[PDB]
Amino acid sequence: RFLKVKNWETDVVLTDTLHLKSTLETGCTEHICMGSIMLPSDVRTKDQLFPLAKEFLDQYYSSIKRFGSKAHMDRLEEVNKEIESTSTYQLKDTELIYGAKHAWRNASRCVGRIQWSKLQVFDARDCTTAHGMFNYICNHVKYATNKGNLRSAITIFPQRTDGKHDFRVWNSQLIRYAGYKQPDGSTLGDPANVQFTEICIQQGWKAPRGRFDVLPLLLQANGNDPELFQIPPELVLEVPIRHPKFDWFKDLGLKWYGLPAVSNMLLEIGGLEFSACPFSGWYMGTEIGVRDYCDNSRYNILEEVAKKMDLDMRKTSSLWKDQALVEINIAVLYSFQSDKVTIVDHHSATESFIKHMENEYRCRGGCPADWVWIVPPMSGSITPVFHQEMLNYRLTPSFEYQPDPWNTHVW
Amino acid sequence: RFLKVKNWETDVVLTDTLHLKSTLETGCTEHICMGSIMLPVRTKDQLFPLAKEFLDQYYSSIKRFGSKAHMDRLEEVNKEIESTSTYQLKDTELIYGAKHAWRNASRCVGRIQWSKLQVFDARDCTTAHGMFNYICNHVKYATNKGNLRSAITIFPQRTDGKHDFRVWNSQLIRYAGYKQPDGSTLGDPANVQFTEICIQQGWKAPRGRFDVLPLLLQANGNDPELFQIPPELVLEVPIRHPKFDWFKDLGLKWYGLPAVSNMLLEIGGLEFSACPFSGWYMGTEIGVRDYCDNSRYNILEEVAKKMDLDMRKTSSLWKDQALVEINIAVLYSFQSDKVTIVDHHSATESFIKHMENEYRCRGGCPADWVWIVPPMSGSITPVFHQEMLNYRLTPSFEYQPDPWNTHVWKG
Ligand code: HEM
Ligand code: HEM
Numbered sequence: 001r002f003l004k005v006k007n008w009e010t011d012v013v014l015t016d017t018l019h020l021k022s023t024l025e026t027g028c029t030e031h032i033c034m035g036s037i038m039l040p041s042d043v044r045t046k047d048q049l050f051p052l053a054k055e056f057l058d059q060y061y062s063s064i065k066r067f068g069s070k071a072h073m074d075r076l077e078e079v080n081k082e083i084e085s086t087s088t089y090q091l092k093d094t095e096l097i098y099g100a101k102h103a104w105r106n107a108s109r110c111v112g113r114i115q116w117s118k119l120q121v122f123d124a125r126d127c128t129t130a131h132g133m134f135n136y137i138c139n140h141v142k143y144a145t146n147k148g149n150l151r152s153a154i155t156i157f158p159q160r161t162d163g164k165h166d167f168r169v170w171n172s173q174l175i176r177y178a179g180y181k182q183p184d185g186s187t188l189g190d191p192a193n194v195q196f197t198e199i200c201i202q203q204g205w206k207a208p209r210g211r212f213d214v215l216p217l218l219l220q221a222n223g224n225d226p227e228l229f230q231i232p233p234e235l236v237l238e239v240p241i242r243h244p245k246f247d248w249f250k251d252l253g254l255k256w257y258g259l260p261a262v263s264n265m266l267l268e269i270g271g272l273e274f275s276a277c278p279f280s281g282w283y284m285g286t287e288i289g290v291r292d293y294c295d296n297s298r299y300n301i302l303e304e305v306a307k308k309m310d311l312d313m314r315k316t317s318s319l320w321k322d323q324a325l326v327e328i329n330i331a332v333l334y335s336f337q338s339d340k341v342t343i344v345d346h347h348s349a350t351e352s353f354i355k356h357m358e359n360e361y362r363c364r365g366g367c368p369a370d371w372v373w374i375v376p377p378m379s380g381s382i383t384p385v386f387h388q389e390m391l392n393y394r395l396t397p398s399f400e401y402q403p404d405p406w407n408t409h410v411w
Numbered sequence: 412r413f414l415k416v417k418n419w420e421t422d423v424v425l426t427d428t429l430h431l432k433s434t435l436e437t438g439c440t441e442h443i444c445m446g447s448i449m450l451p452v453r454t455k456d457q458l459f460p461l462a463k464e465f466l467d468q469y470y471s472s473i474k475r476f477g478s479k480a481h482m483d484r485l486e487e488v489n490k491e492i493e494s495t496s497t498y499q500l501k502d503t504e505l506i507y508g509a510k511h512a513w514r515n516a517s518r519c520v521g522r523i524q525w526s527k528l529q530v531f532d533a534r535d536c537t538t539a540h541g542m543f544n545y546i547c548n549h550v551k552y553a554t555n556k557g558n559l560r561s562a563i564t565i566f567p568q569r570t571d572g573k574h575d576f577r578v579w580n581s582q583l584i585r586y587a588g589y590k591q592p593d594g595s596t597l598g599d600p601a602n603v604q605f606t607e608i609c610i611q612q613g614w615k616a617p618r619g620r621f622d623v624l625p626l627l628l629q630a631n632g633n634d635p636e637l638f639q640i641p642p643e644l645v646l647e648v649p650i651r652h653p654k655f656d657w658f659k660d661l662g663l664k665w666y667g668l669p670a671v672s673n674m675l676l677e678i679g680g681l682e683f684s685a686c687p688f689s690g691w692y693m694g695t696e697i698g699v700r701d702y703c704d705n706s707r708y709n710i711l712e713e714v715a716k717k718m719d720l721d722m723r724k725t726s727s728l729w730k731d732q733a734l735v736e737i738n739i740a741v742l743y744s745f746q747s748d749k750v751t752i753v754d755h756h757s758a759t760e761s762f763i764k765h766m767e768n769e770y771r772c773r774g775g776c777p778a779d780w781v782w783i784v785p786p787m788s789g790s791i792t793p794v795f796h797q798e799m800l801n802y803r804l805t806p807s808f809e810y811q812p813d814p815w816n817t818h819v820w821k822g
């Protein structure tokens with residue numbers, strides 16, 4: 001039960017003991033593996049909350065080499081008293097930063113976690129309003145963008161109290177392109193965002209009705225009705241997409257935004273629930289070129305590219321889709337690199353992640369990792385993670401999925 | 412208790428009740444997923460319940476559950492077990508068991524074909540020479556001058572584990588690999604260890620880059636014996652590219668018939684340790700894995716060089732670009748020679764149709780996403796966005812340790 005993981009390309013074998021510190025459940029059993037289910041899974045009672053806090057504080061004071069010390073047992077008793085009275089408690093700034101960095105470190109589906117300890121944590125727990133939320137988010141966007149030299153950052157709004165005062169960012173990402181249904185049949189813009197683009201218009205947004213319309217922010221503070229805000233265009237760094245060999249690639253009129261900033265997950269630390277916590281890093285190239293541009297329920301521009309390449313699109317066996325997919329992804333990296341916007345290719349990121357796995361097994365005894373999500377969506381087996389056995393388990397602090405607010409909001 | 416899976420590209424949801432018929436374990440727990448782990452002497456005590464389960468299944472399939480033919484067969488198997496400690500399958504039961512072992516193979520993307528399996532009963536076989544003759548006939552039937560036909564040949568079952576029939580080759584047809592004194596490898600690096608055993612057993616190695624290996628066959632627990640498959644039975648395909656004239660000059664070829672021979676077939680508690688089976692190749696098995704894996708023929712560089720790509724930075728996606736061309740050449744070569752092959756697009760589309768049909772008429776289809784998704788262009792195939800449930804049903808094909816590690820040598 002001190003488990004082992006083998007890399008079948010290198011025979012490197014790592015021994016995993018970290019998983020024995022795992023708390024939450026995977027969704028699997030001994031009779032069924034749910035490893036490819038997208039999503040398994042109204043406040044903590046006074047009783048379940050203190051053990052959660054103790055476990056978090058225990059692991060915090062160990063990290064700073066002060067387990068079982070004056071400061072440890074004092075803080076333990078101090079939190080204990082606050083929970084007894086207030087029915088909740090507040091994290092010290094130090095615990096907030098540690099909690100956030102480790103929620104990313106424990107994100108078993110994230111290939112970028114080698115960077116986990118270089119996270120810029122913005123404490124927005126003093127925020128009271130959507131305008132205030134919008135301010136914190138503009139500052140996040142500007143700081144993270146850094147004129148193309150991207151920097152990882154998270155902004156943490158007040159924690160849930162009773163589920164009635166929730167702070168929520170209704171957008172799935174801070175920056176996403178609009179999607180409009182067409183009267184004839186097709187979809188203009190980004191099909192992934194069609195329902196949200198409706199809720200925005202259905203809330204008062206005047207849509208330019210283009211391909212690359214940056215969506216407004218829909219910010220919900222303290223549980224009130226959300227409010228629309230327009231991100232200043234000068235804060236939205238965008239890369240025009242061209243190909244280093246094909247001049248007709250420009251004519252496609254494609255661009256993408258430089259900042260991936262996910263805004264709909266929930267950050268859990270020591271039992272406390274931060275329902276608004278947008279976090280951002282930088283893109284792996286395939287996240288745009290493979291998924292955003294070539295998924296059938298997305299931009300789906302594969303056919304148009306292969307046509308312009310004069311490829312034989314009559315039989316799948318010509319691999320014209322694969323040929324185009326590569327060129328599209330070559331262009332994305334060329335364009336970002338040309339404009340000095342941070343981006344990483346799938347070979348670099350997976351090689352980094354194997355090294356990160358090395359470190360985590362060495363200095364921590366393991367690293368939870370979700371093979372189904374770590375392997376890039378193209379050229380899987382020529383990347384090092386394909387031949388790496390991985391163990392998946394849920395550690396805390398964590399980022400968790402949460403319902404879309406409009407399905408829940410008492411409007 | 413029912414279970415749902417969702418295709419996130421089509422929003423089709425399916426309901427799995429078949430997982431309730433699951434017996435064996437997956438390796439997962441409530442707290443760990445072993446979904447990416449490559450691989451996570453039987454007495455009368457536990458044999459009749461396994462037989463009864465199989466026979467209940469079998470007679471259900473022929474709509475004779477509870478018939479006198481069913482009850483008589485149960486009794487007949489019982490008496491044979493308490494008397495002889497094992498039992499013999501009827502031909503009908505053997506054919507059913509073999510077809511369902513394939514139908515239950517959760518890592519096999521080709522299972523749309525599972526019911527068109529040609530089953531060769533080799534249970535009267537007694538010697539390695541007889542094994543050679545049975546395998547020769549399998550190869551000729553299966554190859555069918557390029558119009559490939561799925562087939563399996565079933566040798567006598569295990570008795571006391573000291574008289575096993577084994578095929579020591581991992582596939583019936585595979586190329587030798589030779590480690591040179593300078594550290595390089597001539598031939599297929601995947602086969603260096605088996606090649607060395609063969610040479611040690613008396614095989615005269617041509618020491619070429621595509622030498623078909625000899626058959627190493629073990630009957631009734633005796634030491635294995637060497638045989639050369641007649642060269643006219645081994646259909647091979649020279650690999651050329653439809654646009655790149657220089658591609659032929661790499662001197663590449665591959666064999667046409669994939670025939671896996673180191674697995675164990677389990678049916679009603681009986682263990683068939685030698686049971687080679689064969690179908691036809693999906694293109695990526697050769698062009699992605701066999702040619703481009705770093706630990707295989709690893710022709711990526713040579714192809715990239717001859718294409719004159721930017722091999723300096725990996726972000727030029729030269730590896731991705733050469734991988735597509737190589738897989739184009741493999742498909743073009745097989746199709747031009749009218750040797751059955753399927754591309755990864757056609758095969759994954761079929762599997763989705765197969766899987767939906769299985770959910771309808773069977774209540775489920777065990778599926779291993781980690782293995783079903785092709786090793787290139789994953790997200791542009793439809794299985795990528797398909798949730799799958801993985802569980803173990805019997806009859807089944809299982810892994811078994813290589814015989815040279817367990818075999819007791821006669822001398
Ligand atoms: C710095 C560069 C980063 C890269 C290249 C990166 C890469 C990725 C990729 C490719 C995925 C798969 C998602 C998909 O395929 O759509 C992912 C998932 C994820 N990333 Fe990272 N990431 C980065 C930074 C971060 C940061 C700063 C955080 C939080 C502080 C984070 C948290 C997550 C989470 C929570 C998931 C999904 C986990 C789940 O759904 O359970 N990432 N990442
Ligand atoms: C007819 C055409 C077939 C195709 C195109 C096909 C395709 C595949 C592929 C691509 C894999 C993954 C192996 C890898 O990529 O390394 C696989 C696995 C497998 N195939 Fe099929 N297959 C076919 C026929 C058959 C037949 C006839 C049998 C047995 C009677 C079979 C049994 C299996 C098994 C048992 C596995 C997985 C072994 C494991 O659990 O590790 N296949 N198949």
Ligand SMILES: Cc1cc(N)nc2cc(-c3ccc(OCc4cncs4)c(CN)c3)ccc12
Pocket residue numbers: 038039260261262279280281282283284287
């Ligand atoms: C910081 C950062 C940088 C980056 N470069 N990439 C990221 C991708 C993610 C992520 C997490 C879950 C997803 O899951 C999709 C679902 C929608 N509904 C149920 S699951 C997706 C898909 N974009 C992305 C999160 C953060 C990222």
Ligand SMILES: Cc1cc(N)nc2cc(-c3ccc(OCc4cncs4)c(CN)c3)ccc12
Pocket residue numbers: 449450669670671688689690691692693696
């Ligand atoms: C009949 C048929 C047709 C085909 N077209 N393809 C096949 C691939 C397979 C298979 C199953 C597991 C494998 O891998 C197991 C392991 C490797 N290392 C540790 S377990 C491999 C690798 N050759 C192949 C088996 C049968 C196939």
Ligand SMILES: C[C@H](O)[C@H](O)[C@H]1CNc2nc(N)[nH]c(=O)c2N1
Pocket residue numbers: 008386387388389390446447448449781782783784786
């Ligand atoms: C560690 C990992 O499970 C291993 O490399 C698997 C992944 N998926 C695979 N999928 C297929 N089709 N074939 C393989 O050999 C593998 N190898």
Ligand SMILES: C[C@H](O)[C@H](O)[C@H]1CNc2nc(N)[nH]c(=O)c2N1
Pocket residue numbers: 036037038372373374375419795796797798799
């Ligand atoms: C059905 C399947 O689980 C789903 O498509 C998952 C698979 N793997 C993924 N992997 C990544 N990195 N991102 C994704 O969105 C998905 N989608």
Ligand SMILES: [Zn+2]
Pocket residue numbers: 028032033034035439443444445446
């Ligand atoms: Zn699992």
